[PDB]
């Protein structure tokens, strides 16, 4: 019983400390049923989408462009579904995911770390220690934003108020 | 036995004859899903049988309009 995060559940068989953020948290059987590389790739993609979504949820409420009407983010999804901008965003996300398919195929073969697209224009994470610290921060922020975006969306669906609009004048249910 | 393009395309789908999982496999999951299906069938049967009224559900021709 040495899972190191849940003391009574033991370390999972393939959850060695090779991966960043590996605290042994896998109570249900998922790493023993699916490839860990694919799981890490899916985790990073979900978390990056969630981080961008949380930042967008803040910014769109705080400021919307001179163009487009003043809308809440969910109403924004509906309006851009009916307008055509959502189709453009879906088209370009699908275009990037077309090569993401090949990247995941490589990850299945090897020669590519899960979630590694070699995207680093500003030249950050110089030296390995800084890279490991940034990896840990990235994974933690990814999971936190994965929880937070669902929190934002379900709270808007329940209270009919946006997040910072809800922070003041809470109006408890 | 004739070899064909469609035959070799579909051959792996008909390759693991008699291959079985170890003892009892995923039987409890199948039993649980069958129990859920039985409950669902009972619900829908009692709905039309009128022995079960849920809300805003009128089993009647007049509900058409």
């Amino acid at each position: 019983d040495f899972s190191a995060a849940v003391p009574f559940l033991k370390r999972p068989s393939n959850l060695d400390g090779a991966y960043i953020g590996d605290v042994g948290f896998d109570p249900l059987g998922f790493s023993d049923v699916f490839d860990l590389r694919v799981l890490r790739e899916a985790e990073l993609k979900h978390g990056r989408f969630a981080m961008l979504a949380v930042l967008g949820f803040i910014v769109q409420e705080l400021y919307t462009f001179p163009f487009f009407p003043k809308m809440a983010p969910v109403d924004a999804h509906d309006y851009f579904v009916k307008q055509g901008g959502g189709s453009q965003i879906i088209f370009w996300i699908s275009f990037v995911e077309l090569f993401g398919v090949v990247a995941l195929f490589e990850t299945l073969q090897g020669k590519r770390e899960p979630g590694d697209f070699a995207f680093d224009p500003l030249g950050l994470a110089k030296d390995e220690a800084t890279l490991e610290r940034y990896r840990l921060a990235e994974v933690k922020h990814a999971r936190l934003a994965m929880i937070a975006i669902g929190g934002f969306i379900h709270q808007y669906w329940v209270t009919k108020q946006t997040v910072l609009e809800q922070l003041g004048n809470f109006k408890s249910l | 036995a004739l070899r064909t393009r469609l035959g070799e395309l579909l051959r792996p789908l008909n390759s693991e004859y008699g291959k079985v999982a170890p003892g009892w496999g995923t039987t409890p999951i199948m039993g649980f899903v069958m129990l859920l299906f039985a409950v669902f069938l009972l619900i829908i049967l009692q709905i039309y049988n009128s022995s079960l009224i849920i809300e805003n559900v009128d089993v009647d021709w007049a509900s058409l309009g």
């Binding site: 393939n14 049923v33 699916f34 490839d35 860990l36 | 008699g18 291959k19 079985v20 999982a21």
Partner: peptide, 26 residues
């Protein structure tokens, strides 16, 4: 993700139960 039943299940037993003949039957 990261055994064969080996039973025919199409087999009739197909074993003939022989009956002997006695002097009375002869």
């Amino acid at each position: 993700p990261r055994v064969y039943d080996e039973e025919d299940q199409l087999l009739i037993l197909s074993d003939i139960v022989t009956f002997e003949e006695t002097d009375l039957g002869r």
